[PDB]
Structures are given as structure tokens and as C-alpha cells.
Symmetry: C3
């Protein structure tokens, strides 16, 4: 039976970066994890239906459309969990124009049944200055108070996940200049 790890964090905080660095560090110690980006799973579905051109248009779609593709992505990822350990790079909540949407509503949560939910955080300062540094995404320059609001709600959603499934909720700080301490923390967790 395989370990299913969810890594979450607002855009710019480094959930994806922490995850790639962690899996390569685990493979050097002999530990096999698969990286899966939840948003890519969805975007293959959405791109195939013609609803979007790029992945940062997904959060602006009608939220019933997002929840339909949200569920197909979660089913395809649950299939992956049978065949290897998996780390899911995704989001505790997604900021849509109609409010925060839970990234793992109970029906999605119950099919992944994640063993651990990791929250990657740093100060909204660093997140904002990091967003201003990367035209690689159509990332929202919000205020730091909007990022602080998102990290607040993401904690609430994640602790709810832990009440429903029994998963532990691990907060890892990923601060400017200290990416390496965060990789130590996440590696220490996955043993």
C-alpha cells in the first residue's frame, strides 16, 4: 500500500519547487515518489474540451465546470496512487471570482484519502516579490493582504481535511534563502 502526500501553497510560495527538489533528494536515498500536478491533470481535460488555452484560465471558469473537471482529475490521480507512491502538488483552496473553492472537497478528499497534507508558507512579502519576478505564469499580483487572506483560508480548509480523513496537516516554511531547510523538513516528514 502506497503513501499519498498532498503539498499545498498559494501561487508563488514554492509548493512546486519544494516538491521537485524533494523527490530528487529522495531518489538519491533510494525512495520512489511520483510527482503529479493536480492543475495539469485538469488542464489536459479542460484543454481537450476547448474551455481554456492556458492553465491560469481555469480558476475563472464557471465553478460548476471546475468541480466537474476537479473530480475527473482526482479519479485519475487516485489511479496513480495504486501503482506508486505519489506527491500531489495542488492547492488547499483556489481563488475564483466567486470566492475560494476547496481544492479537496469531501468527495475528492475521500477518493485520494491523502496520508499527509503539507502547507507551504512564507510571509506575504516574499510571495508578492516572487510573483512580480516571473512572467512564466499569468499569476495574480494581489495585495499582500489578499495573499494573507488566502493563506488564512487555506489553513482552515486544510485543518478541515484532517478532521474528515484523519490526515495530519504539516506546515513547512519556505523562506527566501532557505529553500534547503524546507527540503530537509519535508524529507524528514516522508519517513
Amino acid at each position: 500500500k502506497n503513501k499519498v502526500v498532498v503539498v499545498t501553497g498559494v501561487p508563488g510560495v514554492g509548493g512546486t519547487t519544494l516538491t521537485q527538489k524533494t523527490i530528487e533528494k529522495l531518489k538519491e536515498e533510494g525512495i520512489e515518489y511520483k510527482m503529479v500536478n493536480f492543475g495539469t491533470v485538469m488542464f489536459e481535460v479542460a484543454k481537450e474540451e476547448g474551455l481554456v488555452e492556458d492553465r491560469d484560465q481555469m480558476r475563472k471558469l464557471d465553478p460548476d465546470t471546475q468541480k466537474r473537471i476537479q473530480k475527473l482529475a482526482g479519479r485519475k490521480i487516485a489511479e496513480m496512487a495504486k501503482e506508486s507512491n505519489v506527491i500531489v502538488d495542488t492547492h488547499s483552496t483556489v481563488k475564483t471570482p466567486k470566492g475560494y473553492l476547496a481544492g479537496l472537497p469531501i468527495w475528492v478528499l475521500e477518493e485520494l484519502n491523502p496520508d499527509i497534507i503539507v502547507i507551504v508558507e512564507t510571509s506575504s512579502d516574499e510571495i508578492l516579490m516572487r510573483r512580480l519576478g516571473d512572467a512564466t505564469r499569468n499569476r495574480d499580483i494581489e495585495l499582500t493582504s489578499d495573499i494573507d487572506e488566502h493563506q488564512f483560508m487555506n489553513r482552515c480548509a486544510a485543518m478541515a481535511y484532517g478532521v474528515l480523513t484523519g490526515a495530519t496537516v504539516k506546515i513547512i516554511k519556505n523562506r527566501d534563502g532557505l529553500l534547503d531547510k524546507a527540503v530537509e523538513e519535508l524529507i524528514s516528514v516522508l519517513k
Copy 2:
């Protein structure tokens, strides 16, 4: 099917004023929502049983009585949602002497099945100053820190609602003098 929108906010933050101003501007365009204050539905029952004289006495009743009448109101409101779109002006949590009571415990939540949960917020400074200026109600002069504690727990309960049903959780600021921008935001969320 018909849209169910829940609007929430601590007393004094203007949840009711935002709900009435938004609905009337939508009627200028022919877009009909029916306003339903959850507490009025509760107060009609409580007063008919002889439990209270006014609506601000209900949260000081035995919490078992409140949950009894709370459950009746959710069913009565759910029936209304069959006859038109509804915005439910109500509360993420209610402050009772025995603690915060969820405004939508899970059985009520599943009976209303809302699409959107709106959290109306502003500074506890501005809330306190409105309660002191409001001769329609017997509003509690709490410390500003008790108001911030109530807005903290309201966020927590609301994100739990979004985890359990999939409803999106929208935060809207309703600042002094800027009621109209808050009305503009909600109208936009409801299109």
C-alpha cells in the same frame, strides 16, 4: 434549479444592508432574488411559542432550543428556494453564552445546499462604531478584540461549509462610506 446565496457577517457589519441594496439594484434589470433573514424565520417561531419578545434574545436561549428552531427555519427556507432564487441573510456563527454556534450545522447546510457563502467583513473598529450608532437594535458593546475573535471563527466555519458542499466562499469588504463598492462586488459575483 434556483440559486441559493448565503450572506454572512457579524452584527453591525452590514450583511442585511448589502443584501437589500444588491437585490433592489438587480430588480432594476429584472433579475429577481427573494431576501430571507434566517433570524426572522426563527423569531416568528420563537415568539409564537412565547420564548422571546425580540430577536436579540434568541442567542441567549438554551443552545438546544436554538438548534431546534434553527432546524425548522432551514427547512422552511429550503422550501422557499424551490419557488425563487434566494439570498439568505444569516450568520456563519452565532455568539451564544455557551460559545459560537454554527449557523449552518451540516444537516442545515445540506438542506439549503448553497452555491455561494458570502462573508461581509470590515474592521472591528468600524463595526463597534456602527453598533453604537444603531438605535434599531440592542447591539452588544463588546471589546473590539471580541469582534475580531468572532470574525476569525466565522471564517473558520465558512471554509468548512465550502469543504462539505463545494460552495465557494467569497469575502467582501463593506467599508465606511463604501457600501456601493460592496454592492457592485456582490452584483458582479451574482452574474
Copy 3:
């Protein structure tokens, strides 16, 4: 119908002390509550299976094994409530190296079905300083920001418990030198 009250709080905040003092002043009024420490119940099962020698080793055990023992301890505490009122001295979340673990995952929460969930809080300064004078544990000297992080997540979990069951969620300040005032408050809450 018998009362089930849950009192929760980070280590060092005085949840245990507040429960014992409240029960003695209540018996002077003829009000019988039974104290139950969830961890003591867990440790009885655990030491009988040989997993630990002392109780601070339990939160570092296999979270598959902890939830098996948390599951049985919640079931043993439910039986106690059939025979008397009970105050359960436990924790909203337990801080493990694998993250925060909900103390009442939904299946444990529903077996206890508490009426009131008390959160004991004070400033992270006072908790930290209390941990330093306490040779009954090797007490966790965390930073004050980690103690604050733990109290933030305990609020999130507790409000989720209130959404799922209907329990009221009561915050009680247990400040240095003012234990007797926190005791008055809890007594007042239980009448």
C-alpha cells in the same frame, strides 16, 4: 440525557488544571461531573500493547497505530458518558512531526457527540514561560510563533467540530494569576 464537555488546549495552557478546579467547585454545589483525560485512556491501551513507556512517546508513534488507539479510547470514553456527565481533557489537535493531527476526527467526534467544546487560551508568552518551569514533562520549548500556530489550528479544528455536531465552541482565557476567573467562567458556562 448526560452532558459531554470537551476541554482542549495546547500543552502548558492549563486545560488539565482548569478541569480539576472546576469539578471541585461544582461538587460543592452538588453537581457531579467525572474527569477523563483522553491521553491517559490512550496510554493505558498503549502500554498494555507495549508501544511506549511514557505518554509523551505516544504522539511520535505510527499515526496508523495512534488512530487505532484514539479510536478505541474515544469508544471507551463514550461508555463513561452513558453513566454520568463527563468532562474530557484532551486536545483539538496534537502536534506531531508529521503535522497537526485532529484529536476528534469525525468518527471519534460522532462517538462522543460533545455538547460544548471549550478552548483554553492565553498569550504564547505565558504558555512558553509555563513550559520552562515544568519538570513533569520534558515540555516542548517551541518558539512563541509555533505556539501561536498551534492555537490558530486548534481554533480551525474546533469550529469544524461545531459544524459537524452542533456543539457550541467556547473560548476561555486562562491568564497568569487569574485561574480562579477562568474557573468562574467555565462553571457559569456549565449551568
